[PDB]
């Protein structure tokens, strides 16, 4: 039986840049770095960075829609969200659902989110406004 | 301040096919479904699929070492691997370089992991046997 996420692991091209946008941009804090890796965590996230030589950086009209929403606050997103601006931190993508979410990307256009809202949350929603052909299990 | 993972998003291209694979394969718990995606949950995961058309299905070979695992206990393992094993599911590694791990793939290509152990467990394994250049902070 699956328990969780026990991590996620981005393939990355430098691991300078990425190491220095996951830990000092985002916050997360940095437990161990080797030659090729290194191991972040993020609350509960186990979050790998992995050196790949292929890893492309990637225009976000290049990928899919695959992403990887952080949780924030509230009260703290405005301000979160203002620290990527400043840090020219591109968007991929305007809000247009439920809870505050910001699409940002990292520096090899993995596509990320600030998120603020649980799955319970979303789906009381979706109780009240159905998408379409929506059906609950 | 980001405080861990809030969602997962996997484009996919068939929905039916990948609500399958993670709700009847992998067990995880199916809350809703609608044209365009579905919502599980895996633990405390939210999992989100999303139907693209730009979803490609990609061989393990073109892709980069981007991927998501996935927690199981150590008494679960092995006969969860050996059930995606003879259920015909599609690898992608064999090399265990980061614990016990059983690497697989979704239909679309997504690479997935079973793991066995927490992101402290592979700190206190990785100080005996360090991966090249490796630092604990
Ligand atoms: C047509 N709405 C999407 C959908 C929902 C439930 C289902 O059994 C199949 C498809
Ligand atoms: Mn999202
Ligand atoms: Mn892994």
Redesign the interface.
């Given at each position: 039986?699956?328990?969780?996420?026990?991590?996620?692991?981005?393939?990355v091209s430098q691991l300078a840049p990425s190491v220095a946008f996951y830990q000092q941009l985002?916050?997360?804090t940095?437990?161990?770095?080797?030659?090729?890796?290194a191991?972040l965590?993020?609350?509960?996230?186990?979050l790998?960075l992995?050196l790949?030589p292929?890893?492309?950086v990637t225009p976000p009209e290049e990928?899919?829609?695959?992403?990887?929403?952080?949780?924030?606050?509230e009260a703290?997103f405005a301000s979160?969200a203002a620290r990527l601006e400043a840090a020219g931190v591109a968007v991929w993508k305007l809000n247009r659902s439920e809870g505050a979410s910001h699409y940002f990307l990292d520096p090899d256009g993995?596509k990320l989110?600030?998120?603020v809202?649980?799955?319970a949350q979303?789906?009381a929603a979706?109780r009240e406004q159905?998408?379409?052909?929506?059906?609950?299990?």
């Open positions: 039986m699956l328990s969780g996420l026990n991590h996620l692991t981005l393939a985002l916050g997360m940095l437990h161990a770095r080797w030659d090729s890796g191991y965590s993020c609350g509960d996230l186990w790998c992995s790949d292929q890893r492309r990928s899919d829609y695959t992403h990887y929403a952080f949780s924030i606050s703290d979160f993995h989110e600030l998120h809202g649980s799955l979303r789906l979706c159905p998408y379409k052909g929506m059906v609950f299990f």
